[PDB]
Amino acid sequence: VLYTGLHQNWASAAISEYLQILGIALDKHSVVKNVSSLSSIFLSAMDLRRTVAASAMELDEIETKTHEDALKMVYKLAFRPIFSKFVEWATTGLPKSTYRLYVVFGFLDAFFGTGYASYIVDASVKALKAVEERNLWKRVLCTLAKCFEHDQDGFWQAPAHFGAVAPVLVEQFLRNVNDVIQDVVPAVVELAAAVESQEHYKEINTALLKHLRNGSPGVRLAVVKCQQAITAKLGEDWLHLLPEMLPYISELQDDDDEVVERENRRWIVGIEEKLGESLDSML
């Protein structure tokens, strides 16, 4: 009986505690027509706060709370019908006024976790694009990998979905926190595993070659990983590269430092299965 009244009172009050209260009431509700309206108002105002003002700990906390609130409402009040509207708000959040990559992307990841793939595509694209909301980017890149395992060929790594994703990913390398790139390089592997036969090979292998040069072992582990799913994924070409790869491994051998060891070992075993004769290069 009170809820509409309580909300308006809190809005007038709108101290960050009031924002918390509003979100708290929205989730704790029996409400719906008002909850929907209230949710909208909360989003608008939070956006104003970020744009003008954007305390940091509190705001991040409120934003994190908002994401959960958004998740709560979306489930209760289906995703496909809401999605159009959801996209518009997120787009508004962009640098004119962050909620975006971190919390929003995380939410999208959750919804992600084939019918949905067409609808999802633009949003996934936004996540990749927002490099800096690095965390946001990492989450999306990670999602692509998860999509690989679930969808497979359906994922359209070989198919339709891949073409947009690969160029977004490629561009990411081209233009951006350094930490994103390693995740990017492994994703290529997952993409490859799914697609099998589709032709990014020249660009990717070359990219891997340059990367093969350093950036901590973080990059190395990632590069080895990308070669490995590429090798399995195809069960197709790559022979030319084997001599570069083993020599990549050779340099690693002299280096004396670990996580890459596991990955390098995994690749060598993979090479043996595909290539066979690669022993000669090893010896």
Inter-residue contact 124 to 143 (CB < 8 Å): yes
The experimental method behind these coordinates is cryo-EM
- Where the chain is discontinuous (C–N > 2.5 Å), the residues before each break are 14, 30, 54, 77, 97, 113, 131, 175
| Dist. CA 120–CA 4, nearest whole Å | 34
Let me know how long the chain is: 283
Inter-residue contact 39 to 89 (CB < 8 Å): no
| Dist. CA 283–CA 278, nearest whole Å | 9
Question: Residue 129, Cβ neighbours under 10 Å: how many?
Answer: 16
Inter-residue contact 62 to 98 (CB < 8 Å): no
The full DSSP string for 82-131 is HHHHHHHHHHHHSTT---IIIIIHHHHHHHH--TTHHHHHHHHHHHHH--
> What resolution (Å)?
7.3
Report DSSP state, residue 100. I
Q: Of 276, 210, 196, 191, which Cα lies nearest the Cα of 248?
A: 210
Long-range contacts of 242-247 (CB under 8 A, 24+ apart): 242/271, 242/275, 242/278, 242/281, 243/281, 244/209, 244/212, 245/212, 245/271, 246/271, 246/278, 246/281, 246/282
Cα-Cα-Cα-Cα dihedral sign, residues 36, 84, 173, 246: positive
**Residue 187: exposure state from Cβ atoms within 10 A (0-12, 13-18, ≥19):** buried
| Dist. CA 147–CA 190, nearest whole Å | 9
Cα-Cα-Cα-Cα dihedral sign, residues 142, 148, 154, 158: positive
| Residues whose CB falls within 8 Å of the CB of residue 66, separated by 6 or more in sequence, listed in order | 23, 42, 43, 46, 99, 103
